[PDB]
Amino acid sequence: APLPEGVSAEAMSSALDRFARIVGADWVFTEDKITPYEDPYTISNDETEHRPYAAVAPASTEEVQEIVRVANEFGVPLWPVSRGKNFAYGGAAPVMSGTVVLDMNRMNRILEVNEEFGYALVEPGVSYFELYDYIQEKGLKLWIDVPDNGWGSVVGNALDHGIGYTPYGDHFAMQCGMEVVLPNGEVVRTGMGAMPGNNTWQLFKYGYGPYVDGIFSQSNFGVVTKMGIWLMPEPAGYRPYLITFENEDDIETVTERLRPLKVAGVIQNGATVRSLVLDAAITRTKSQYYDGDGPIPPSVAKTMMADLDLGMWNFCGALYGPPPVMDTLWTAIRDSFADIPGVKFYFPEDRRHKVDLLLHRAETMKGVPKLTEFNFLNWDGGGGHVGFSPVSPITGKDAIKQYNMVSSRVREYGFDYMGLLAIGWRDLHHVTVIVYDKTDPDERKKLDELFNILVDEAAAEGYGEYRTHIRYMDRIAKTYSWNDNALWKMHETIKDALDPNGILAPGKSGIWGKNRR
Amino acid sequence: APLPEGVSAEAMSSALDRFARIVGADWVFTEDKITPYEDPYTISNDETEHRPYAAVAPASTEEVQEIVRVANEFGVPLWPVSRGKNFAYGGAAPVMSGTVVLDMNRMNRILEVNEEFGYALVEPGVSYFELYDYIQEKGLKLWIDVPDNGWGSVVGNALDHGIGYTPYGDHFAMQCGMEVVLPNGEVVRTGMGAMPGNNTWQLFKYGYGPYVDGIFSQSNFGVVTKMGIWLMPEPAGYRPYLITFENEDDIETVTERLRPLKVAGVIQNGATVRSLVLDAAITRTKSQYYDGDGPIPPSVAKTMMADLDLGMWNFCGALYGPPPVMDTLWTAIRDSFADIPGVKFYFPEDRRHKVDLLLHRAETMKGVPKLTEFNFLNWDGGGGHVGFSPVSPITGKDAIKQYNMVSSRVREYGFDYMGLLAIGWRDLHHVTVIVYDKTDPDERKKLDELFNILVDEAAAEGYGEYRTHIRYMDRIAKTYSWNDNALWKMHETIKDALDPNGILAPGKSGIWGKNRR
Ligand SMILES: Cc1cc2nc3c(=O)[nH]c(=O)nc-3n(C[C@H](O)[C@H](O)[C@H](O)COP(=O)(O)OP(=O)(O)OC[C@H]3O[C@@H](n4cnc5c(N)ncnc54)[C@H](O)[C@@H]3O)c2cc1C
Ligand SMILES: Cc1cc2nc3c(=O)[nH]c(=O)nc-3n(C[C@H](O)[C@H](O)[C@H](O)COP(=O)(O)OP(=O)(O)OC[C@H]3O[C@@H](n4cnc5c(N)ncnc54)[C@H](O)[C@@H]3O)c2cc1C
Ligand SMILES: [Cl-]
Ligand SMILES: [Cl-]
Ligand SMILES: [Cl-]
Ligand SMILES: [Cl-]
Ligand SMILES: [Cl-]
Ligand SMILES: [Cl-]
């Protein structure tokens, strides 16, 4: 780990000393204890890149504030993580080496769960597992909404615009109220929490005046120390389904049919249409169907589909509510797809495998945290992953163009194509997942190169990334370049106003601050 | 109209001159032509307050930018309005006298309406009437969501956190993408619009990085020149209803029953439970039931209820979707209230009056713009109104405490109590509307005083205002005072960074800028 540029050993040493006084000497980590904070899915081949210098683990908001005041005095940068499980995005590691990680794992109090109003107020350390377990224990009739990684932070995930698979799938949309330590060490509360004596912090997003909560998501404009989130009341009924399509070209008409269903909200959760290999790899690995080094051939695809009762495309969704509602919505959904040759429709009871994609996703779509999804990392013997999830119109043409662009490249590079088409509400994402051997330098180099080209080519077709790995944060920022990067010039203006010393997470979302820019 | 403090006649004159060059001499207004921009509902008795000095009406974004550059050179403040129909909030008038109004009425292009994706991209001048009429003409299967004032701006209303009465009732929540002229004259686009070549500006809110759209709502951080908004697909069915309650104390149990219905979204639009007089005054005036100068007595309330088939509380709501869905949801809603003594349930066909509250609200709850609501201003012979709409928990106790606090004061002051309980999703608002004779100085003084006391007393019970009249913008801002006004210190930090010369709308949301603070 290099020192961060511009920062002396005397400075970094005096700071680490004062941090230790603030949080106690037990909660300042260095040297050997810093490896948990390295990116678990190494992309770079240069070991001077994305290296944390140290980590400090405060117990409270006020300790966070003192840390930040100290960081300001010594010019030492901080990289805040809630729990730091941002796997595929860098884990807990900074964009910039020398950055001291601010690990808020120990701030894990569930401050409130309110059944009657359907919310929680949580600290950054609270995991999905913990919140879920708290709810189950108290018997509250509330669902949470989990990403495929159950170990993540409710806070951290939402601040990064993460998603899940219930009607409450847009995590940051369900955010309501936050406490923030600003980069100068001042503490503020957004919304109704700015009003002393309110009982409305988790009931009404705006409060009064400029709506600023969003500026602390995908941002280095502050450290979030408390955050509210809305929780769905247990519904009166729940039916998960899987609809399979046999032909790779079906995704065009499938996307066309999904469009009105999503816009009108007939489909109540995110639509996910996953490619064969991405779904297969939940229950199977490559060597069980194909011994070659290259991607699987069509004949092997067909075998896999026949074994697993999957298609080339697999649409998982769920119905929620009283049976009459669920039946009516299902009529509309099923009728939208029934005339496509080869289509098949499944509820859980129709699956003949007891370990099965639908049975797994059934849990995720009712907000049960699991680690099952990490299975796809075993596809080629064990590896890391990176994901590329640009936004596009919900159009057949856009869906199949991205499929064609991505699969051809990915397969040319020797990887299997693992993709899905995700629809939030009016937004389509073609999500590429590439599993690679992160221990092999030749494979990292190929991945890095493939990734860049995918990004470049997608951007030119008008498809921009909304969430990315620490390594590509600058690159993605350059996508949004209208009027000579006018938006990022504004971000930098706010950055310098709130963080003149540039001590919060230099490089996050490609925002640097005047000192490093 | 006084000059704005700190600004010379030479400066104000050179600026008005350069504005005229930018937009043409026809589109700079002064003296007599400035009266349309006065508050129509005068509250102040001091005619030096909230007076606009001049108004300038650009044709384009780029003209806006040149105006702003000129404003910066001469230190002349601007007050931007989309259409300036903010009736009950000041209309088009500035907080601070001497402020030149930036009227964007002529920027009224509907840039796009997309049926397949359910959105519009509009300029600030577009009215609800215009957008509605455009849709009807083209035969697009889309609803809009209108406030009770149909003459408002789709943009302006949303930026002020305005509301309506369909499922798309939270206007700023449905906002997606905006173009903004910053206070330095630079132009930026938020979200996917920052990415050149996107077709996704109105499909995905976030883009990448800090989510900043909200900072330009209830704000003087920029001028919005284009804005996207999501539009609901025409639903498969629509049944509006009215549920009446006979007793003033029923609102307690009514609010308790509404809570789970709203949180779970069984009620698909905003719930509005309006008091007798507020609903009566849509079709009747006071002198038709009572000749006294004071508020109506109970005996007269009873007569009105029996004439109009209204209760002391009137819950308007609507069902949306296929009949099976609507029936199922109605079963849950009706069962939630059926056991309350005196309760009555109406669909349109059950109303015996052809001019009737439900028949009016039926239109509003399917997004048809109307001016009918302004009828309540005739309650006591013709007047203005002001509204007070603080947030509270959805609780019977909170509902009836606010009813008791407000009605007693309002009636003591000689006004009739006109109130409603509004529920967005998890948020209750007790909304006080007070109709007053705006031409009478004694009545203005009483109103102003009543308003202050209501605000003070509500704040102490933990109920804070989310939207207010230009006159009370500072006052409401002081509500949100946690940690020595930490939030507003942050607002002011951003204000000085984006607007160092303080030329955009000094005082909006009680944000002033370093020059005037
Ligand atoms: C197999 C697999 C499946 C995945 N599935 C999903 C999925 O379905 N949905 C999804 O959203 N993601 C998914 N991910 C990505 C990721 O693992 C999750 O999003 C995870 O929840 C994020 O980590 P975290 O919650 O611990 O957040 P953190 O790592 O704590 O935070 C993420 C980032 O947010 C910022 N941040 C966090 N806390 C603060 C704070 N208090 N103040 C300021 N900034 C802060 C920082 O930039 C930080 O680096 C997946 C990854 C893998 C490998
Ligand atoms: C009887 C009655 C009923 C009402 N019912 C409702 C209702 O149901 N729902 C509701 O929401 N309101 C309601 N109102 C309040 C108000 O009339 C409406 O909200 C109206 O739609 C707002 O005016 P406008 O749309 O022309 O916005 P504008 O007056 O153009 O804008 C409002 C404010 O937003 C800011 N602003 C506007 N445009 C920009 C921009 N481009 N850049 C920067 N800042 C900008 C300014 O501060 C401006 O003063 C009601 C009022 C009355 C008297
Ligand atoms: Cl969704
Ligand atoms: Cl084996
Ligand atoms: Cl079913
Ligand atoms: Cl709503
Ligand atoms: Cl008459
Ligand atoms: Cl019905």
Residue numbers in the entry:
A (entry chain A), B (entry chain A): 3 to 519
The publication says:
Enzymes of the vanillyl alcohol oxidase/p-cresol methyl hydroxylase (VAO/PCMH) superfamily are found across all kingdoms where they perform a range of metabolic functions. One of these, the 4-phenol oxidases/dehydrogenases, catalyzes the oxidation of para-substituted phenolic compounds. A fundamental distinction is that the oxidases efficiently react with oxygen producing hydrogen peroxide whereas the dehydrogenases hardly react with oxygen and typically employ other proteins, such as cytochrome c, as acceptors.
Spectrophotometric measurements confirmed that the vanillyl alcohol-reduced P151N and P151T proteins are hardly re-oxidized by molecular oxygen though they retain dehydrogenase activity while P151G can effectively turn over using oxygen as co-substrate and the product is formed.
